[PDB]
Amino acid sequence: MQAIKCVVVGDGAVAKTCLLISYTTNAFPGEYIPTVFDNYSANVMVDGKPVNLGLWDTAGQEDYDRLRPLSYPQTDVFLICFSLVSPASFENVRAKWYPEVRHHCPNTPIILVGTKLDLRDDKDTIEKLKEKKLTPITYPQGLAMAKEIGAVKYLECSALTQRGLKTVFDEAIRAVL
Amino acid sequence: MQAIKCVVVGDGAVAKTCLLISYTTNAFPGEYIPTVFDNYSANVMVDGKPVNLGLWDTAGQEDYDRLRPLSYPQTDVFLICFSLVSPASFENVRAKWYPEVRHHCPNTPIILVGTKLDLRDDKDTIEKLKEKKLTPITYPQGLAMAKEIGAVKYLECSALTQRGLKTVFDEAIRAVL
Amino acid sequence: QELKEKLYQEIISYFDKGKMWEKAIKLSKELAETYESKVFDYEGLGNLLKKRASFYENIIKAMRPQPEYFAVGYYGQGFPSFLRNKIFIYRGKEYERREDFSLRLLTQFPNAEKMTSTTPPGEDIKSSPKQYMQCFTVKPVMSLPPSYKDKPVPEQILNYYRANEVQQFRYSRPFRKGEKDPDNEFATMWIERTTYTTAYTFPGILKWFEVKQISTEEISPLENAIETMELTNERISNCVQQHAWDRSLSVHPLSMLLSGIVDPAVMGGFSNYEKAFFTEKYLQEHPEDQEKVELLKRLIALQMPLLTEGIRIHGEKLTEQLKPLHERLSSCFRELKEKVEKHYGVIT
Amino acid sequence: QELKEKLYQEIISYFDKGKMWEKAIKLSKELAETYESKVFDYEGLGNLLKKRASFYENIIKAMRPQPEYFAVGYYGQGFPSFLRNKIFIYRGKEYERREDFSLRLLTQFPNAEKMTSTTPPGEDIKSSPKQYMQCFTVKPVMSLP
What we know:
The PDB classes it as signaling protein. With 177 residues, chain A is α/β, with parallel strands linked by helices. Helix content of chain A is 36%, strand content 17%. Chain A is built from six helices and five strands, in the order E-H-E-E-H-E-H-H-H-E-H. In chain A, helix 1 links the parallel strand 1 and strand 2 (51-57). The longest helix of chain A is centred in the middle third of the chain and has 18 residues, at 87-104. Chain A is globular and about 50 Å long. With 348 residues, chain C is of the alpha+beta class. Helix content of chain C is 51%, strand content 12%. Chain C has twelve helices and eleven strands. In chain C, strands 3-4-1-2-10 form a five-stranded mixed beta sheet. In chain C, helix 7 (221-244) runs parallel beside helix 11 and helix 8 runs parallel beside helix 12. The N and C termini of chain C lie far apart (66 Å). At the A-D interface, loops of A face loops of D.
């Protein structure tokens, strides 16, 4: 048997925790149950052989920054997550999350994923962002960032419709493969 | 498994058939049951390993002399039987039984046994024989005959008390051994 | 629990070094039941199954000597209290004869006087201060399980019960009742068998066990002939079945049996039976006893197909060495068939 | 009798090439009972015991994937009579996800309209001439002997 270790990081304004718990629960969209505990581990494979998948639930709070650097060593892969409709998430990634995670483990394949793909094309959300002088991050910016970081494959997933989330996890599992 | 073939011959005035059927039956002396059939085969061993013992019941009648010569070939041993208290049996052995059996199978170990060992020392039987000008054959004559024929071991058995009969059969079985 | 498992594995080891199978196989079934139902000890279960399979193979392949059985009774006040006026049926060892057993038993009691008669002793011998020992052979009585009733159990299995799981014991008592004809020795055949009953089965906790009840019987010459015919038919059937399930088996037992059946040259039992029963003299002797000769006729008639099967297997094994022997066998087989069909008047 | 023994040995072969154990182990116990009680086929009994021991070893050693379970209900008059207004609980295969299963099921019925809600449909969807398919995952309930 083999196990997969992956570190998922992000800000609290995007709430990747809901997406992760919905994926682990495999429940129907819109009917997820938030749970008290973090660190949702599960035994789900896609191809090759059954393996154990680990998802370290990292808090977006700045106070727990001293607890994160020790989780990076001896980890198979890392998942940097941002939102295409949240410019604040993009700024946070470009400022703190991308540089520090890259610095901690320079030699590891990286996968970049986009959160809230559904709200990227939403007219009301775009109107509200433009009113709040916010610009939804589109595909070219994510592609440019992925080419800058040399990611294996840039991805875009969603939570309300789960669009590509299973493909995202398949790519994450097969990155080592 | 191994089997033993032995041809037993004798006259009708001694009745070795009773002795043979008493040995095969293993019954108490004086309580033997004569049976209708001849050729009493049995599976009894003494030493080494269990083997099958065959005793070809040969009739003393002269009419069945044409049936006897074919039983001798491909036989392990032969048992020449006579009576120490019957001079007629000794004369018959010296005249017909010993020469013909020896002639049929010149290359085979031979065992000579004496019947009615109990009546050899019986005073009334000896008195009746002397009245009938008959002399009981004693040990020296049998020993001389055995040395003449080159027998492996001369023996003397009995039927009423079964004296040495088991030893006789043990010697017959171990002759090949 | 650890004591139980240690004892069970000691049982396994002893059965491995004990050559006993039937009780071993039953206990192996029980141990497999306990394994699968309660403890789920799979490796021990597999080893147990392997050993049981080895027992099954050895049942068909390995040879089991049949222990002999002797009845010994000690009489006289010179024996200890546990030997005085009692009879025990001793289970002989491998190929152990009565002579060696008697010698070894007399070695234990030099003062014992060897009784030369099988007749039960009177009060004088029992109350005498000396030691009197009587030893003789008895025949065990086979007891089959009810599970094997009405079934063609293999002979390798039946021979086990023929010498094991036995309580009763029998012996033959020849009695003379009739004319002392010089030739026909069967004219005075009367049998009064001795019935021995034992409350415990052999083998058991002890090699020997005392008799509980003893009974006597009486066998008329017709009944004696019926029993001899039944015994011979069973022997022939057993030999035929054994050789039909065997390939590298010698024809010597077949030759001996066929020579015995065909020509009782020393003492012809067929003619003796003819003179003893088929003659009108016996009908005067037994006016209302006539159905027994019918049983004899049907017994020999049912023997006939068995003799035909023996001829078939002998011809299957026929060679140049057995060519004249088998020629005589076939000639006498045809002769006896014609005899039973025409002269005897029986219906086959 | 020969048909029975041929079928039993075919069962043995299929269990050898089937990786199913619990029912196989029960049937092996029954076959051992039949062997020892009725037919005394000792070599077949020994081979059966060896295969049962292999099943026992594989139970502890070999890994068993847990099949997924999805509930699918077909609504609308466009489905055949054996699919109309009925719900079936489908046993997913090895590591089979709901997305792949839904794609494969929609491949069978291109005219099927994929229902996006788990709420039971009303009379309109059931009586509609179109094909409406609803697929979602359900959790099996363990039942111990």
